[PDB]
Design a protein around this ligand. Structure first.
Ligand SMILES: CCCCCCCCCCCCCCCCCC(=O)OC[C@H](COP(=O)([O-])OCC(O)COP(=O)([O-])OC[C@@H](COC(=O)CCCCCCCCCCCCCCCCC)OC(=O)CCCCCCCCCCCCCCCCC)OC(=O)CCCCCCCCCCCCCCCCC
Ligand SMILES: CCCCCCCCCCCCCCCCCC(=O)OC[C@H](COP(=O)([O-])OCC[N+](C)(C)C)OC(=O)CCCCCCCCCCCCCCCCC
Ligand SMILES: CCCCCCCCCCCCCCCCCC(=O)OC[C@H](COP(=O)([O-])OCC[N+](C)(C)C)OC(=O)CCCCCCCCCCCCCCCCC
Ligand SMILES: CCCCCCCCCCCCCCCCCC(=O)OC[C@H](COP(=O)(O)OCCN)OC(=O)CCCCCCCCCCCCCCCCC
Ligand SMILES: CCCCCCCCCCCCCCCCCC(=O)OC[C@H](COP(=O)(O)OCCN)OC(=O)CCCCCCCCCCCCCCCCC
Ligand SMILES: CCCCCCCCCCCCCCCCCC(=O)OC[C@H](COP(=O)(O)OCCN)OC(=O)CCCCCCCCCCCCCCCCC
Ligand SMILES: CCCCCCCCCCCCO[C@@H]1O[C@H](CO)[C@@H](O[C@H]2O[C@H](CO)[C@@H](O)[C@H](O)[C@H]2O)[C@H](O)[C@H]1O
Ligand SMILES: CCCCCCCCCCCCO[C@@H]1O[C@H](CO)[C@@H](O[C@H]2O[C@H](CO)[C@@H](O)[C@H](O)[C@H]2O)[C@H](O)[C@H]1O
Ligand SMILES: CCCCCCCCCCCCO[C@@H]1O[C@H](CO)[C@@H](O[C@H]2O[C@H](CO)[C@@H](O)[C@H](O)[C@H]2O)[C@H](O)[C@H]1O
Lengths: 68, 73, 81, 85, 85, 80, 72, 494, 170, 100, 188
């Protein structure tokens, strides 16, 4: 089994046999191929999930502070 | 049967499907599989059944007006 | 630049860039068949619309010209003294 | 529709970072789009002034805490609206 | 519940008019920052405090990130667990 | 330009002829101002009358199958 | 400038015509024709719905009360 | 002779003619196919004649023949407003089942046609017989010809698939046999009119329920138990898959209006919470795993499990609305599941020879007509208004909620998750990129055969979704005799 | 008239969608646009007629769902709130069609686009003119289908596919 | 009252909607009992349908003043909504209940 | 009831069941294909006899114990002794899944055998007229309303005459609120 890495992270400029999905013809596929493809839920890489809970926590506190 | 059109059958994808169709031959009883096999089959349906038992005929909204109560029991 | 497309593909909505030569004649024919269906639907409404209030005798209300319930009222109201 | 015209007028590009000038090239679009932004911000005597600002004053009009809170909250919403416009 | 009479008479002129002042104040401020003093915003973007506040809003309160990862991808793995295990 | 023309097609006529046929048949089969059904309507209700013919046949069968319900108990529950 | 309309309907190339396979005969005359004849006859079928019956009585019960107006 | 026996004898006459024409001629197989299709047209013609003469508010069985020559096992054929539409669905479906698979069989064509003509007889019988032991006889005679319909005309995993349906359906049906045998011994017969009179003691009804439900949970099928369907409804030929899903799946839906609702009411009432828990789980677990299915035909089969749960919860609501919505959703699934097996197992598998969804993409670009019908079928499977499927779900869910409000709320998740699997499959095959690169050459769009069976099936779904009273008027009076209950000022009148 | 407002946007869509071959790109554009234009005048008239005279309009055509206690009609009611909603709906639909005669001028598929536009207008009319909550739900779902069909109009863009699934399931 | 239609004779129950004093082994009488209970319950629910249709017209006739002018129709409709449901006969067939 | 000495009875099963398994090991040695000797019955096939002894002793003891604990005699105890028997069955094979699987398979049989009645000996005879018993249950078509209410209960759409007045009482006793629905009509 290959690593479970989404093809959203592959290069959008390589010599892919299938440019739309970023795949070469006989390449091995992870068993989770259905949901690793270009038409699958997106991976957001702006911040780590732990830090986001903090920042959305800060917005909530300020909103409560304005309410108070 | 009928001859189909030419398909670039992918050696990779064919064996992926051949993996899935034959997958069950390799399932084993481990500590991990029992945990999932116990939660989905027993806990979650038992939990649903308990709520279904305790709320049976508990509430009726039919014709109920103000001054009357939704609870039937 | 117009996209290259396969010419063997048949599509009810034309496909790519499809305009026939006779399109004005086809368009005209479709206009009448629409206008005929709408006319049947209008005669239906005229005879099945239901109002509990009746329009004033003097204010603009072009429905008074085609709806039976209203027209029967004003015809009856046009009988007094 | 106004912002639809500016996207078409260039390359079907959509990014603000690569648009500039274009006030002389698109005289009608800017005015009409500024017709819209003046009412979007509810500039006095626009179509938005008679609706958007009545909710703000009717919010404070309902003399309750929740009414006052949403006045303050929606007022901040107004100021950031004027900002991105 | 009605508030029309109060909103017509009770509200003071300050809160009745306040959105106009804010719009006329921050508009000239925004034009000045966007054109006259085109350096303050970059200090903000390239401050670390502003680098984070900027990316919190550009990323839409991180809502999509959380839904897609915690809600949507949970359902796909639940479906996988039921199918495989 | 070109001169490849398009016939309106059979689908156009079946759809229009379908719409015409429904309105024509529906208007024909209406009962009327007050009662007075059509000759076809009088024919239809006549053929499928069965005023008591199902009730008379089902009553006999229920009686006999009740009777053999009793008779099978009697024969299968006899003293050894 | 618009291109000419095109396409092989049923995959029939512009030279030849659709060859009848066999099904077309009974499916178009028997299968569909049975449904049109069913639809035409369904109009004259009498209505034995429980509602048409229950409405006529239930109107007469309400007519005794002031709830519905009686013509007589 | 009765007119309900004419429905049975015509397919029997058709089997005789297919086997005795080659004796009047090396005759062509085309003439084998025409005879079988004409003879399923006649059954449809007769069945509509029966429907014109039906009486929509009669509480006696209709089209009965007085036998008065009693034996041990006698066929009694009656039609009722709760069974009429199941018969009509059978007779409309079986011609499309033949036309759908017209060029795809290619070998053993006589045997194929003789099995389907045999199947139509047995499935017509199961709705027409007036005994519960007679019901069981035909409910299980369909089992041998289906073992052979899959092993002769099935796909690669056909052998295991044919063993699964036969053995699961045999096992589950033998717990129903024990309960039928108990009812007959207590009452003396299994003729409907004598059973519905009789009221069993609570404990006996609690043990007849355990036995009729084991069977129907095996034959719904519920989630824990559906491993035969994911094999049989996929490895089978296209015509086999249409009958199995549209008609065979409903044998237990119509078998609850006969075997449970009128003769075991106290058990049905006190055990409903167990049914609803099972039904809620199969609405979720089946919906979750219909997302992750890489076989297109298997994805359609898994959809049927989630649909069947909604109608099973409707038939256990003790409400007039969930009972009629259950029949409507049974009919609705019949037309729509038929079309999606026609799309999956009969068009893509005809052109690609594969069912893996990895090879498909952007089929709208070269088959616009397939895309149009595939999307309408996919939206009915998603329970979208203007289709008969939406009405069946709305009324099924309402009764589930009025009876036990918590399970209906978990059943209503279907609204969200049926839409998620249906759109995701449609978007992956028709949309979702460009024409896939695994397609070495181009693929023709729909043939005139493929267009007109999809068009026929889609038309039934819409017109019945606009005017469901075409089916509701027959159901109201007859359904009104399987409800159990009283209201305080309306009961025990003087 | 009132039941003609409902029907015209529907009819134009049928011609443009299943008959785009026959009328062509221009033929579809005229019928789709003009049919929606006509509906807009009919609804300007209905505003003065219903609102400015306080005369609600009822029509009932046939049953949809007829079970005991549950009778939902294929019926419509024009009241003060109804006619207010139609005026923005029909003008903005009427003008966006005219706008689109030039915006989509280079697109390969105009008969499909203008069909979806007419179809969308029909569904908002159904949504705001129903008698009951359940026929309201036909337009509520109908506009949902029409949105998915138009966020995904260029179905060859995977981004467009993702956003249409998101519109649909949310 | 409205004249009783000809179609309203072949389906008019001839029997009181009860099971008291009804021999069950007499199938015709038992089936007619069953039919007599089904039709009373159905007339009761169609009585609500008609009152609800009148209420609807009263609502659109009076508009703002619906809250005062349509209450008698409201009262009748809300009584039928709890008094009438189609519950079948199966319970009444299998149980005997008396006033005492 | 009369308490029973669990340890005594438990040994009896060990000797009864183990005694039979000792005869099975005797078959194994007699059919041995080599010159294994007489004492091989206790060395080569001893584990065969031990597992019978283990299973027999667990079952009768655990059942007799569970009989004492619940102070009742019924089909249930034949279950508890059954599960503890299959539990001991799987202890030999050393696999955890077989411990649960054997116990489930073992205990479900023994409960099913008992609850269904003793079939393998003489089935219990009620000694009553079968024609009367069968005919009563065929013609017992109606029941007293009170009888059905006990099993199902009033409610869930079973609203017997007087349900509202009783419901008034039930709600008043529990919630403590007087029921007084609104007239919903401004006149009378
Ligand atoms: C309900 C929900 C409906 C949902 C929307 C579906 C709309 C239909 C699909 C879109 C239209 C389409 O594909 O048209 C192409 C296709 C052919 O287009 P064409 O330009 O007419 O070509 C005519 C052929 O050259 C020559 O004809 P042919 O080769 O198509 O042969 C078939 C033709 C003639 O067959 C024979 O002569 C034999 O018609 C028949 O078979 C006659 C009986 C048809 C009965 C249909 C049901 C009636 C009720 O249309 C059809 O075949 C459909 C016919 C029925 C359409 C009804 C609905 C129309 C729209 C409303
Ligand atoms: C009613 C109007 C329907 C218009 C259909 C247009 C059409 O045929 O498009 C085919 C089009 C193609 O038409 P086309 O002519 O643009 O072809 C473009 C070229 N191709 C596609 C070959 C690359 O096919 C599709 O896009 C597939 C999806 C069909 C969507 C069907 C729309 C209506 C669905 C019912 C909605 C009801 C909602 C109820 C709630
Ligand atoms: C609550 C009930 C369940 C809610 C979830 C229902 C759907 C279940 C998952 C279905 C996923 C299908 C497969 C995904 C395919 C795909 O790419 O979809 C992309 C879409 C989302 O798109 P995206 O976010 O991946 O797209 C990112 C890339 N751009 C922005 C450029 C397009 O998937 C969904 O829509 C998932 C469902 C989200 C539902 C959110 C609303 C409810 C929130 C409640 C709190
Ligand atoms: C409830 C409580 C929480 C909610 C209220 C508080 C919310 C957070 C307030 C602090 C952050 C406000 C914005 C700070 C400045 C900033 O980052 O603006 C970015 C924005 C976009 O700028 P951009 O287009 O990227 O490039 C510069 C173009 N002139 O810049 C612009 O649009 C330029 C014009 C405006 C610049 C000044 C904005 C001042 C806002 C106060
Ligand atoms: C494509 C859509 C339109 C399809 C054609 C519609 C019109 C043709 C209808 C064919 C069936 C005949 C029929 O029932 O017509 C009824 C009516 C015209 O006939 P009419 O004589 O007015 O009937 C009333 C008694 N005098 O006509 C009608 O009542 C037509 C009603 C059409 C639907 C109105 C909007 C409802 C859905 C939104
Ligand atoms: C997108 C929607 C497109 C719709 C296209 C078709 C439109 C058909 C319009 C039919 C208009 C009927 C004109 C006459 C008025 C009704 C007369 C009547 O009694 O009809 C019986 C039945 C139900 O109508 P009714 O019981 O009157 O409903 C109450 C509100 N009028 O009404 C019937 O007879 C209905 C039987 C035909 C079924 C129509 C839908 C089939 C598709
Ligand atoms: C769509 C399906 C809808 C039906 C299913 C859900 C129905 C839910 C009905 C809830 C209300 C039923 O009736 C309601 O009982 C709850 C019981 O806690 C009471 O709730 C109250 O209980 C206590 C008193 O005991 C109060 O102090 C407390 O403030 C509040 O929780 C309400 O006073 C009563 O009105
Ligand atoms: C309870 C039993 C099970 C129930 C299901 C019954 C299924 C019955 C299947 C149909 C009967 C057998 O069907 C029979 O198939 C054989 C296959 O060799 C056919 O026999 C023929 O097949 C092909 C057909 O082209 C010929 O080339 C070949 O020369 C000849 O043997 C018979 O013409 C057909 O009648
Ligand atoms: C796994 C298998 C679990 C058990 C399967 C069903 C077992 C049936 O064995 C059970 O025996 C009891 C006692 O005789 C009987 O149960 C019933 O018997 C008589 C009727 O015969 C009733 O009046 C009595 O109320 C009840 O005890 C039934 O015969 C059956 O319910």
């Amino acid at each position: 089994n290959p690593p479970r890495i989404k093809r959203q992270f592959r290069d959008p400029h390589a010599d892919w046999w299938d440019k739309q999905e970023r795949r070469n013809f006989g390449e091995p596929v992870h068993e989770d191929h259905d949901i690793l493809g270009m038409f699958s839920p997106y991976e957001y890489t702006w911040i780590t999930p732990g830090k986001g809970l903090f920042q959305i926590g800060l917005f909530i506190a300020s909103f409560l502070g304005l309410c108070y | 049967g009928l001859q189909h059109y030419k398909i670039a059958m992918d050696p990779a994808l064919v064996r992926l499907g051949s993996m899935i169709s034959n997958r069950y031959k390799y399932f084993r009883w481990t500590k991990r599989t029992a945990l999932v096999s116990f939660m989905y089959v027993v806990v979650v349906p038992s939990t649903i059944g308990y709520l279904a038992y305790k709320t049976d005929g508990l509430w009726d909204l039919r014709a109920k007006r103000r001054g009357d109560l939704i609870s039937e029991r | 630049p117009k996209i290259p497309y396969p010419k063997h593909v048949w599509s009810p909505a034309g496909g790519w860039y499809a305009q026939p030569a006779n399109w004005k004649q086809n368009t005209a024919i479709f206009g009448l068949v629409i206008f005929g269906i709408t006319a049947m639907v209008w005669k239906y409404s005229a005879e099945h619309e239901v109002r509990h209030k009746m329009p004033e005798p003097d204010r603009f209300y072009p429905s008074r010209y085609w709806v039976k319930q209203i027209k029967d009222y004003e015809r009856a109201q046009k009988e007094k003294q | 529709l106004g912002a639809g015209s500016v996207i078409h007028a260039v390359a079907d590009n959509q990014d603000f970072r690569k648009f500039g000038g274009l006030i002389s090239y698109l005289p009608l679009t800017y005015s009409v789009m500024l017709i819209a932004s003046l009412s979007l911000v509810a500039f006095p005597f626009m179509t938005g002034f008679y609706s958007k600002d009545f909710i703000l004053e009717s919010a404070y009009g309902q003399f309750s805490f929740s009414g006052v809170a949403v006045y303050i909250i929606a007022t901040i919403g107004a100021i950031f609206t004027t900002l991105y416009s | 519940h009605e508030i029309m009479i109060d909103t017509e008479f009770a509200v003071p002129v300050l809160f009745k008019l306040l959105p106009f002042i804010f719009t006329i104040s921050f508009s000239v401020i925004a034009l000045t920052l966007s054109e006259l003093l085109s350096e303050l915003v970059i200090y903000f973007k390239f401050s670390r405090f502003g680098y984070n506040i900027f990316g919190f809003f550009n990323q839409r309160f991180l809502i999509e990130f959380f839904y897609n990862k915690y809600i949507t991808n949970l359902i796909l793995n639940l479906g996988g667990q039921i199918t495989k295990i | 330009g070109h001169n490849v023309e398009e016939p309106l097609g059979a689908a156009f006529y079946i759809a229009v002829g379908g719409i015409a046929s429904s309105f024509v048949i529906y208007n024909i089969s209406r009962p009327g101002p007050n009662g007075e059904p059509s000759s076809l309507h009088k024919w239809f209700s006549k053929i499928s009358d069965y005023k008591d013919e199902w009730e008379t046949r089902n009553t006999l069968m229920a009686a006999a199958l009740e009777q053999a319900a009793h008779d099978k108990h009697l024969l299968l529950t006899a003293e050894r | 400038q618009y291109d000419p309309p095109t396409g092989w309907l049923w995959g029939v190339r512009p030279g030849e015509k659709y060859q009848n396979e066999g099904w077309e005969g009974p499916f178009f005359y028997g299968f569909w024709g049975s449904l049109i004849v069913f639809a035409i006859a369904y109009a004259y079928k009498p209505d034995t719905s429980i509602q048409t019956w229950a409405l006529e009585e239930a109107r007469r019960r309400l007519e005794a009360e002031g709830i519905l107006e009686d013509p007589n | 002779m009765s007119l309900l026996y004419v429905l049975l004898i015509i397919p029997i006459i058709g089997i005789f003619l297919i086997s005795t024409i080659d004796s009047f001629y090396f005759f062509n197989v085309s003439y084998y196919k025409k005879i079988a299709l004409i003879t399923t047209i006649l059954n449809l013609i007769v069945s509509l004649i029966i429907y014109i003469l039906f009486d929509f508010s009669n509480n006696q069985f209709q089209f009965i023949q007085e036998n008065l020559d009693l034996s041990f096992y006698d066929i009694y054929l009656g039609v009722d407003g709760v069974s009429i539409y199941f018969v009509l669905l059978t007779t409309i479906i079986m011609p499309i089942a033949l036309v759908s698979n017209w060029n795809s069989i290619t070998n053993n064509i006589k045997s194929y046609l003789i099995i389907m003509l045999l199947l139509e007889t047995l499935l017509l019988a199961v709705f027409l017989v007036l005994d519960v032991l007679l019901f069981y006889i035909f409910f299980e005679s369909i089992l041998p010809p289906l073992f052979i319909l899959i092993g002769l005309f099935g796909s690669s995993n056909k052998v295991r698939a044919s063993f699964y349906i036969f053995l699961y359906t045999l096992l589950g049906s033998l717990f129903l046999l024990l309960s039928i045998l108990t009812m007959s011994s207590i009452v003396g017969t299994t003729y409907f009119d004598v059973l519905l009179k009789s009221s069993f003691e609570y404990t006996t009804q609690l043990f007849l329920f355990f036995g009729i439900f084991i069977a129907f949970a095996v034959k719904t099928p519920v989630w824990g138990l559906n491993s035969w369907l994911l094999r049989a409804h996929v490895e089978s030929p296209l015509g086999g898959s249409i009958v199995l899903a549209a008609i065979v799946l409903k044998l237990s839906l119509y078998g609850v209006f006969r075997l449970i609702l009128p003769i075991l009411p106290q058990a049905s009432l006190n055990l409903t919470y167990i049914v609803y828990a099972i039904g809620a789980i199969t609405v979720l677990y089946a919906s979750f795993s219909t997302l992750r299915t890489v076989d297109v035909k298997e994805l359609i089969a898994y959809s049927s499990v989630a649909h069947a749960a909604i109608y099973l919860m409707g038939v256990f609501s003790n409400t007039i609305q969930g009972l009629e919505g259950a029949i409507l959703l049974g009919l609705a699934h019949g037309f729509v599941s038929s079309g999606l097996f026609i799309c999956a197992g009969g068009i893509l598998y005809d052109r690609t020879g594969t069912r893996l969804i990895y090879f498909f993409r952007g089929l709208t670009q070269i088959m616009p007509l397939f895309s149009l019908f595939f999307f309408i079928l996919c939206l009915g499977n998603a329970g979208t208004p203007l289709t008969l499927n939406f009405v069946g779900e709305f009324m099924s869910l309402y009764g589930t909620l009025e009876r036990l409000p918590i399970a209906g709320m978990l059943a209503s998740t279907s609204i969200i998750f049926s839409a998620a699997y249906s759109i995701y499959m449609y978007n992956r095959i028709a949309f979702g990129g460009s024409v896939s690169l695994y397609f070495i050459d181009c693929f023709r769009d729909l043939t005139k055969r493929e267009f007109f069976i999809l068009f026929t099936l889609v038309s039934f779904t819409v017109i019945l979704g606009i005017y469901p009273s075409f089916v509701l008027d027959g159901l109201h009076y007859n359904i009104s005799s399987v409800v159990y209950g009283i209201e305080p000022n309306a009961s025990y009148l003087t | 008239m009132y039941l003609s407002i409902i029907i015209l946007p529907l009819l134009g869509s049928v011609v443009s969608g299943f008959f785009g071959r026959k009328v062509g790109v221009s033929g579809a554009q005229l019928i789709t646009c003009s049919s929606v234009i006509i509906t807009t005048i009919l609804s300007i008239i209905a505003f003065f007629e219903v609102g400015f005279n306080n005369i609600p309009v009822t029509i009932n055509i046939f049953r949809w769902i007829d079970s005991e206690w549950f009778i939902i009609n294929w019926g419509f009611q024009y009241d003060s709130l109804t006619v207010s909603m139609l005026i923005p709906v029909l003008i903005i639909s009427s003008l966006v069609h005219i706008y689109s005669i030039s915006y989509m001028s280079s697109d390969p598929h105009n008969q499909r686009f203008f069909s979806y536009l007419s179809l969308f207008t029909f569904m908002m009319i159904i949504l705001v003119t129903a008698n009951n909550y359940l026929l309201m739900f036909v337009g509520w779902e109908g506009v949902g289908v029409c949105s998915y069909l138009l966020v995904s109009f260029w179905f060859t863009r995977i981004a467009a596919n993702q956003s249409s699934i998101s519109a649909f399931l949310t | 009252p409205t004249p009783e239609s000809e179609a309203f004779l072949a389906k008019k129950p001839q029997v009181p909607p009860t099971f008291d004093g009804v021999d069950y082994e007499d199938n015709k009488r038992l089936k007619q009992a069953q039919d007599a209970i089904i039709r009373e319950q159905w007339v009761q629910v169609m009585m609500g349908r008609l009152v609800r249709e009148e209420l609807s017209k009263c609502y659109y006739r009076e508009g703002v003043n619906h809250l005062e002018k349509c209450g008698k129709l409201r009262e009748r409709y809300l009584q039928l909504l709890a008094n009438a449901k189609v519950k079948g006969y199966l319970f009444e067939q299998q149980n005997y209940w008396s006033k005492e | 009831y009369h308490p029973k000495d669990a340890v005594h009875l438990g040994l009896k099963g060990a000797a009864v069941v183990g005694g039979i398994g000792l005869l099975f090991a005797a078959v194994r040695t007699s059919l041995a294909r080599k010159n294994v000797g007489p004492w091989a019955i206790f060395t080569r096939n001893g584990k065969l006899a031990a597992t019978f002894a283990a299973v027999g002793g667990a079952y009768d003891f655990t059942r007799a114990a569970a009989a004492n604990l619940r102070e009742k005699e019924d089909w249930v105890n034949n279950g508890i002794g059954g599960l503890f028997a299959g539990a001991t069955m799987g202890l030999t094979t050393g696999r955890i899944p077989r411990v649960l699987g054997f116990a489930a398979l073992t205990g479900v049989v023994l409960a099913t055998a008992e609850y269904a009645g003793s079939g393998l000996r003489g089935v219990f005879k009620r000694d009553v007229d079968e024609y009367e018993r069968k005919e009563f249950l065929r013609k017992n078509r109606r029941r007293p309303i009170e009888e059905t209410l006990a099993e199902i209960g009033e409610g869930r759409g079973i609203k017997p005459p007087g349900y509202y007045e009783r419901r008034a009482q039930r709600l008043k006793e529990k919630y403590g609120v007087d029921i007084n629905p609104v007239c919903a009509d401004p006149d009378q």
